[PDB]
Amino acid sequence: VRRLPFSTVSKQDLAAFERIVPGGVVTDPEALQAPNVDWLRTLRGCSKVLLRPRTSEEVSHILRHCHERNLAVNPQGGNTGMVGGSVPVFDEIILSTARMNRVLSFHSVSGILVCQAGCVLEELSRYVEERDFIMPLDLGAKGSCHIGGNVATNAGGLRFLRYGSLHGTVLGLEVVLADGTVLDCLTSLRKDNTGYDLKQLFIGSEGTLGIITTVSILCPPKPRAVNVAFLGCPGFAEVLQTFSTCKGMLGEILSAFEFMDAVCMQLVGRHLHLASPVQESPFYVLIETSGSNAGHDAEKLGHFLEHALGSGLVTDGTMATDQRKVKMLWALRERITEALSRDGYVYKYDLSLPVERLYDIVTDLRARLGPHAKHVVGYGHLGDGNLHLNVTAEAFSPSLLAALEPHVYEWTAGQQGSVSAEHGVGFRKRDVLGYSKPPGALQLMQQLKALLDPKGILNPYKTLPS
């Protein structure tokens, strides 16, 4: 809210930065406009300097200068973050990883990838898929998000159900600390219990403890067969039983279980002009499988589908194994987030709740907000207990905000839930962590912040309470 007492970038700093990163000092005001606006376009900084380093040493030397001079630094990846973490609040220097986009190694047997933090996820998937491997994560933002940003936010995504957390799949990190110190935790070993797992501190630290410059990550083998079932369910009770049966009948081949409601389908059709492949239903379920024997998987899917259609859990369904049609079906889920931001102003919540009542809050909000909201939708990673709750209006209303907050956060807390399951904290949620974290935890976080960045030059105004 109020600017902390940081120094201001002088002409001497610009000349220093040009020496440190020649060719990588952008000061054109119109060029700085885009990197100052977050993905949602509701926060806008006034940074006048963007730095685009190529190597880790350049990053180390930049922070060295910023440390001695007490200049605030805003690390930025793909700028797809959802919580206002990726753009300055005032005039923080934007340090972009855009040019740190080289792959450093890939071991063709272990599947271990070492790459720079600014490699785009989409591009890394292509690289390892040419070598019969896949990334352990995927997101709708794959086209723009940087692997460094994924690690900094501890991104979940669409294959978390199968491959799990970056806390498990990240093997090593190189991090540049606030004072310029290069921390080498860039191991490429599957197992290494020689002291504290220091890298874990930086996974989910959202650039407040250091800038990730190099990532080592374990890539799963590429599946021989990927199948997608897109199913229509007549209610949420059946969605939950479809999930239960899916785990019983598909089991270890399951790689994704996503859901969306009717309004979500309508919004992707209206704003993005993507047609539904099944009959209209109140709820839709996208199931993905990944396995080593295509015939065994297809056999598992067949028996699962026949009984689920037979027991009335699903009303209408379409299956796909052709690469083109799988991506078609995935687009119906992946592009919901785009359709919402085209419907007007979006109030965005990312909650962890008990799966058995994951949708109850959507129905509650629909009764609580009547004609004062345009749409209320619920979708997301049901398999991981993670609901994406969004309310749209043609324009922002302080009334509607007062109706949504703190009510939504209080409901989640009554369920011992998380007020930010995946997207993190950043600027937007810094003052609502008390609904998921007790004061002693939040205090220790501040002590770690004070140890690693005593001057607070890395990402001020985030991601800890005011």
Identity of the residue, 236 or 427, whose beta carbon is nearer to ligand FAD in the bound complex: 427
The verdict on whether residue 337 carries a ligand-binding annotation is yes
Residue choice 80, 242, 281, 352 for contact with ligand FAD (CB under 6 A): 80
Cβ neighbours, 10 Å, residue 175: 28
Of 238 and 384, nearer to ligand FAD (C-beta) is: 384
Please name the residues in contact with 417: beta carbons below 8 A apart, sequence gap of 6 or more: 351, 352, 353, 354, 436
Q: How far is the CB of 368 from ligand FAD (least distance, A)?
A: 27
271 is in an annotated binding site: no
433 touches a copy of itself (CB under 8 A): yes
CB 88 within 8 A of CB 47: yes
User: Is residue 22 near a copy of itself by the rule CB under 8 A?
Assistant: no
The answer to whether 196 contacts a copy of itself (rule: CB under 8 A) is: yes
423 labeled binding residue: yes
* Least Cβ distance, residue 194 to a copy of itself (angstroms): 4
List 189, 237, 401, 402, residue binding a copy of itself (CB under 8 A): 189
Closest separation between CB of residue 151 and ligand FAD, Å?
A: 7
Binding of residue 459 to ligand FAD (CB under 6 A): yes
When binding is defined by CB under 8 A, the residue of 3, 102, 131, 296 that contacts a copy of itself is: 296
According to CB under 6 A, which residues from 287 to 316 bind ligand FAD?
Answer: none
Q: Does 332 bind ligand FAD (CB under 6 A)?
A: no
Considering the rule CB under 8 A, would residue 323 count as an interface residue with a copy of itself?
Answer: no
Asked if 190 touches a copy of itself (CB under 8 A), the answer is yes
Among 48, 52, 61, 146, binds ligand FAD (CB under 6 A): 146
Site residues for ligand FAD, 104-133, by CB under 6 A, read 117
* Residue 77 is a binding residue for ligand FAD (CB under 6 A): yes
Q: Supply the minimum distance, in Å, between the C-beta of residue 316 and a copy of itself.
A: 25
Closest residue (Cβ) to ligand FAD? 149
| Site membership for a copy of itself, residue 263 (CB under 8 A) | no
378 binds, among a copy of itself, ligand FAD, none (CB under 5 to 8 A by kind): none
Name the binding residues for Zn(2+).
381, 388, 422
Name the binding residues for (R)-lactate.
333, 423
Residues of this chain that bind ligand FAD (CB under 6 A): 39, 75-82, 85-86, 97, 117, 139-141, 145-146, 148-150, 152-153, 155-158, 206-207, 211-212, 337, 422-423, 426, 459
Name the binding residues for (R)-2-hydroxyglutarate.
333, 337, 348, 390, 423
